[PDB]
Structure 1
Amino acid sequence: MEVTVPATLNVLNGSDARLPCTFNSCYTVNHKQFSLNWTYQECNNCSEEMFLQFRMKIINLKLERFQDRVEFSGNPSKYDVSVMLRNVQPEDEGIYNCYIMNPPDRHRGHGKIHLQVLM
C-alpha cells in the first residue's frame, strides 16, 4: 500500500489547505474493515495526537484548536482520503500523519506531510 502525499505543504494564512492522503490498494476497499487513522504531531519530541478516524463512519473528535475547522473531504471508495483545513492560522504549522489500514491487505500504509504557513 503505497501512500501518495506531498512531503512539504505551504499554504497561505487564512486560506484553505488541501491535505491529500491517497493510496493504491489492489483490494476493493470495504467499509466494514477499512480504517483511517488521522494524527498530527508538531515537533518530533512532542507527542502525536489523533483528530479523525474511520471505523464504520467518519468520526471527528472535535479537538481544541482543531475545533470546527476540520471535516473529511474525501471518499474512501475511490482511494481518496483527503482532508481540508479551513482558514489556516500560524498555529497548525506542523507535521501531519495519515495512517491507513485496508484489510485484507496486511501492510499498514503511512503518509507523512509537513504543513507550513506563509504570512
Structure 2
Amino acid sequence: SNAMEVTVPATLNVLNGSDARLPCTFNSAYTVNHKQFSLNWTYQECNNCSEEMFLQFRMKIINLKLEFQDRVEFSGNPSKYDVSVMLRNVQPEDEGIYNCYIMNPPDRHRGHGKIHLQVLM
C-alpha cells in the first residue's frame, strides 16, 4: 500500500561461466501499459560505486550494450509483471549490485529491487 512490492533475491550466487538469471517480479493493482511502463536496470561494482544503466524498457527493451560485452539479455515479460534479466556466461567482474527500478503508471509508487550477485569459482 505504501510502496510497490518488488521480489528479488537479496543475494544471488552463481558459478563462473554459468548463466545467471536475475529474477525480478513486482505487484501492481494496474495492468502493464507498454506505452507508459518504465523499467531501468543498473549495475554497480560495489556498494558506494556509481550506477551504470545497462537495460531499459521504454516502449520496448533497450539494451545499452555496456562494454558486459553482449552477455546481457532481457528475460522477463512485463505484462506478466516479470522484469528479470539474464547474464550469460558470468565472469568474475560481474560481481556487484544489480538494481531494478520499476514504474507502472498510474500506480504512484516506484519499485526498487536490489540483488547482490556473487561469482563462485
TM-score normalised to structure 2 length: 0.95
In 2, the alpha carbon distance for the partners of 1:108 and 1:73 equals 21
> CA offsets per residue over residues 43-66 of structure 1, 9 Å max, x none?
2222110000011110001111x1
CA RMSD after TM alignment: 0.7
In 2, the alpha carbon distance for the partners of 1:98 and 1:45 equals 17
> CA offsets per residue over residues 80-105 of structure 1, 9 Å max, x none?
11111100010000011000011000
In 2, the alpha carbon distance for the partners of 1:9 and 1:114 equals 6
- What aligned pairs does 1:1-119 form with structure 2 within 5 A after superposition? 1-64=4-67, 66-119=68-121
In 2, the alpha carbon distance for the partners of 1:44 and 1:19 equals 18
Structure 1: gaps of 5 or more residues: none
In 1, the alpha carbon distance for the partners of 2:47 and 2:119 equals 18
In 2, the alpha carbon distance for the partners of 1:108 and 1:98 equals 10
When structure 1 is superposed on structure 2, of 76-85 and 41-50 the one drifting more is 41-50
> Post-superposition shift, 1:15?
0.4
**Identity %, equivalent residues:** 99
Give aligned pairs, total.
118
> Post-superposition shift, 1:21?
1.0
In 2, the alpha carbon distance for the partners of 1:16 and 1:61 equals 19
> Post-superposition shift, 1:40?
1.1
